[PDB]
Amino acid sequence: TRQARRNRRRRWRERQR
RNA sequence: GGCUGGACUCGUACUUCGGUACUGGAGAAACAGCC
């Protein structure tokens, strides 16, 4: 599913926010 | 959270109008796994 990018991309990206 | 993604509900695109697809969009690094 898309909830992988919403956990993989989400975990590497939130780090920036 | 130290790491991954399997649903949701949305917003937005599509589309048979069901339903899926976009986390270069959130609630929410929530829940599951290991907890």
Curated annotation (Swiss-Prot):
Subcellular location: Host nucleus, Host nucleolus; Host cytoplasm
PTM text: Phosphorylated by protein kinase CK2. Presence of, and maybe binding to the N-terminus of the regulatory beta subunit of CK2 is necessary for CK2-mediated Rev's phosphorylation. Asymmetrically arginine dimethylated at one site by host PRMT6. Methylation impairs the RNA-binding activity and export of viral RNA from the nucleus to the cytoplasm.
Record's signal peptide: none
Basic residues bias locations: 3-14
Short sequence motif Nuclear localization signal and RNA-binding (RRE): positions: 1-17
Region ranges (Disordered): 1-15
Additional notes on this entry: Isolates WMJ1, WMJ2, and WMJ3 were obtained from blood samples sequentially taken from a two-year old Haitian who was perinatally infected by her mother. HIV-1 lineages are divided in three main groups, M (for Major), O (for Outlier), and N (for New, or Non-M, Non-O). The vast majority of strains found worldwide belong to the group M. Group O seems to be endemic to and largely confined to Cameroon and neighboring countries in West Central Africa, where these viruses represent a small minority of HIV-1 strains. The group N is represented by a limited number of isolates from Cameroonian persons. The group M is further subdivided in 9 clades or subtypes (A to D, F to H, J and K).
Domain notes: The RNA-binding motif binds to the RRE, a 240 bp stem-and-loop structure present in incompletely spliced viral pre-mRNAs. This region also contains the NLS which mediates nuclear localization via KPNB1 binding and, when the N-terminal sequence is present, nucleolar targeting. These overlapping functions prevent Rev bound to RRE from undesirable return to the nucleus. When Rev binds the RRE, the NLS becomes masked while the NES remains accessible. The leucine-rich NES mediates binding to human XPO1.
Assembly notes: Homomultimer; when bound to the RRE. Multimeric assembly is essential for activity and may involve XPO1. Binds to human KPNB1, XPO1, TNPO1, RANBP5 and IPO7.
Annotated function: Escorts unspliced or incompletely spliced viral pre-mRNAs (late transcripts) out of the nucleus of infected cells. These pre-mRNAs carry a recognition sequence called Rev responsive element (RRE) located in the env gene, that is not present in fully spliced viral mRNAs (early transcripts). This function is essential since most viral proteins are translated from unspliced or partially spliced pre-mRNAs which cannot exit the nucleus by the pathway used by fully processed cellular mRNAs. Rev itself is translated from a fully spliced mRNA that readily exits the nucleus.
Protein name: Protein Rev
Organism encoding this protein: Human immunodeficiency virus type 1 group M subtype B (isolate WMJ22)
Source taxonomy: Viruses, Riboviria, Pararnavirae, Artverviricota, Revtraviricetes
